Amino acid sequence: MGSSVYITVELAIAVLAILGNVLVCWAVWLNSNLQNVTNYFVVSLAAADIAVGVLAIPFAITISTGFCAACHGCLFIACFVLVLTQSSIFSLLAIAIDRYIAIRIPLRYNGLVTGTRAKGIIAICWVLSFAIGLTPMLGWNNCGQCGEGQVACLFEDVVPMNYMVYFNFFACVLVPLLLMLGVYLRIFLAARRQLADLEDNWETLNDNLKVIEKADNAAQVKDALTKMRAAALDAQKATPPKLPEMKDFRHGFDILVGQIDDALKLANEGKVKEAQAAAEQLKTTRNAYIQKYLERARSTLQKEVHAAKSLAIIVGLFALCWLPLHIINCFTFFCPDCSHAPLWLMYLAIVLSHTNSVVNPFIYAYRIREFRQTFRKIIRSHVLRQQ
Template sequence: ALQTPTNYFLVSLAAADVAVGLFAIPFAITISLGFCTDFYSCLFLACFVLVLTQSSIFSLLAVAVDRYLAILVPLRYKSLVTGTRARRVIAVLWVLAFGIGLTPFLGWNSKDSATNCTEPWGGTMNESCCLVKCLFENVVPMSYMVYFNFFGCVLPPLLIMLVIYIKIFMVACRQLQRTELMDHSRTILQREIHAAKSLAMIVGIFAVCWLPVHAINCVTLFHPVQAKEKPKWAMNMAILLSHANSVVNPIVYAYRNRDFRYTFHKLISRYVLCQTDVFKSGNGQAGAQPALDMGL
């Protein structure tokens, strides 16, 4: 069934990916044009994508811990990781993601140094109402992006996930080498390894897609002279790659998961193709759903 703790975390990740497609990408395009607006409106556009990125990282971390417990303590897993606890964890993680992403609103921003537009609001010269050129780097300081966002909130979870998946494969391989494992237990363990492989791939894809942006941010902060010489297309390509992550993720965690694939096919057949009996067996009974499998 789809209503498992692991799938709750995957749905949380999917929600972040969908929100990136619907909101973050248009916002990113908007704040790359340099149009004139008030400072905090521009800051909100810039921070919203940070919220979604952080929620993706937390969802990936939650899935990694979930799979680690499934491999390490399989007999106690169902009592430790319940649907209710998973939903509570997801709620806490999203609150934390909003807190981290919206931190610039608390004062860690570039309001004092933002480049103002030549046309003040309403044609007056009131400085408090003056518009700013809406660019990401004009409202969010690189110190926040590097020290707090990258070193504090992105890199540590990625390193933790790397350690977790290494330990998962080490523990799983040791258990598979035990000759006394029953065939049923061995099959379940192999399925967990396949699931871990798919989820580790998601983490790897996330790192490949997002590390270039953070690397450029680090160069901008620590080597400002060299950063001025970098071609504009480099940053644009890095941003494009980061948003492409939200397109790649569903292919891995949805299409590779039999439960998701079965459900998608069922929904399309029933509501798009209007076929109500496509998933019924020859005796007219509905076919059984396949077991959870995220194997590659």
């Protein structure tokens, strides 16, 4: 029977959505390291994911087939998952904003994103999600056309199809959904490419520094030095130290290149052994002046890629799960002449949306390493409090 597989899966998902996200909250709370403000919103997301696994899913199973209830009451069952959805779109929105305010402006952050302003941002969304989510209950419903005073609750017969498309989807979801991927797919892409270039330069001058020490004639030296001077110049304009004022950075490269030129001058003059002797100085010159920034830059990007990629995946799946259900509501509203999407497809669109509140923990398990071994960290944190 298909109906059992539905309720079987519906309950199965509800279990994971609860257990998965509840684990996140323990790690976010038990583990001290995972207590960064960015996880404050991770909790708001997991809290909404928990509410979906507890209340939303049962509410869905019931309205799946309809039921007799008041119009002012049945809107809760049908339009409660709406609040949890907008809350998610608000939580992801914050994490996307919290991560951007730290990638492009790592300076004015700890004075810009305090623990208190964050706590207020979350509540203002839930009360605004309750407002956006439970909007049809203010007096925008189709329960006009059971017992005395009760109306047949079936969603599409109660929820205005123009509220799910124009407002909920377009304004409250589609706008924010596109807003986040377009930014972090670029940040993840620009960073992805930028990190690759920075390494090819560090490796090309690190490699060509060796070809000079073990070189035969003056040609090999003149050619490597040229390739080195290319990498240094490329790296020079590629590693801005955030923050021309107070930059002991442009001086660094100009000390390095200054010796590459003296070396090319040596090689060009046919002084190979004398030119390769200056190559060892370059190692010392690289380690002394430039090595500091090469590493500092390669680290900042490894965080941009891992964070944008992570946040992109979270938002990526969130948009990949909630779109089919919104696409149907669009193909249904803009083409009333089209046959309404079949239940077997409608059901499949509802079931998928419930999964988004399950992947988040899995994503964190496949991405956040701290959250991963956080159990062994909680244990050790307790056994240590014994001597």
